[PDB]
Amino acid sequence: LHRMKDLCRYMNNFAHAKYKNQVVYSTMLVFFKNAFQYVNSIQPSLFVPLVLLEDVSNVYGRNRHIVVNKAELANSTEVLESFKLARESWELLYSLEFLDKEFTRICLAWKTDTWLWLRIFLTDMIIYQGQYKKAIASLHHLAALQTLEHQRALIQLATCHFALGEYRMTCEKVLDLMCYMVLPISDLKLLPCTSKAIMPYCLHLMLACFKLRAFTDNRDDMALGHVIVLLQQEWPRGENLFLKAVNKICQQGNFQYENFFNYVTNIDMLEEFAYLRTQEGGKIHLELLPKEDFRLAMERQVSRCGENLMVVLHRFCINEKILLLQTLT
């Protein structure tokens, strides 16, 4: 590819059929070879499927990189190299004008559906590119052509709908995503189509969305509730954000997040809320219920310590689908 780049550099910067034919066809075979390798690595069912995502790890805080662990993908280095080389092949195909035209021709001559392997590989290059609308269209193409590949389509739609500032369509796609994910448990990521890597990513997605929806100097209370509920995930990393939420509630003093004692299964949450209610965290009026009934409800909930966190978080996600109304901001 780079020998051709030097030779094609010379043939492009300035019939000359040989150079253009080489730059198209040699790239054509190498592009299908590398794309076949990539989609034989990720989503291997076309010849656990893997998906090229964008995980926002810092929810408490041509030159793109894929953050894939060596555990879920032990051959991640050369798979990433093959994806990069095929992306460069596609870029060099569409870069030179004659190469662009006759590559479009040769790809149109074969199955323009791009099957599923080539279609997935196009979705992956486009998501890695930084452009998400053609990625979303290619994922719709997948869904038309197509937890197996439904997990693939939904999770890729989620990461292409995040796209730096949508924050709602991602939530809807992800909510429809766990509907297929039933299990009792900061850059682009490549995670499998299983719960272990998709559930934390989806929860971080909702956490970031509701964090940006909540801390906007407004009086939105439901967003604060969603924020606290999702923050239970991965303690004690959410310590500072919970402290900020407590300070905000002390400033306001009108927390009305009914169904509160149905999702908040954390001892520290309840101890802090009781701290706020006695004299010293202020005298903060808390409508956590849909005087005695309040302490009585906290006494029921301290008895529910444990209650493995993903089960209750998934129950919150599926039962309270009305979170899209607060997600509108």
UniProtKB/Swiss-Prot annotation:
There is a cross-link at residue 134 (Glycyl lysine isopeptide (Lys-Gly) (interchain with G-Cter in SUMO2)). Component of the integrator complex, a multiprotein complex that terminates RNA polymerase II (Pol II) transcription in the promoter-proximal region of genes. Component of the Integrator complex, composed of core subunits INTS1, INTS2, INTS3, INTS4, INTS5, INTS6, INTS7, INTS8, INTS9/RC74, INTS10, INTS11/CPSF3L, INTS12, INTS13, INTS14 and INTS15. The core complex associates with protein phosphatase 2A subunits PPP2CA and PPP2R1A, to form the Integrator-PP2A (INTAC) complex. INTS10 is part of the tail subcomplex, composed of INTS10, INTS13, INTS14 and INTS15. It is found in: Nucleus. This is Integrator complex subunit 10. Belongs to the Integrator subunit 10 family. The chain holds residues 285 to 710 of 710 of the full protein. It comes from Homo sapiens (Human).
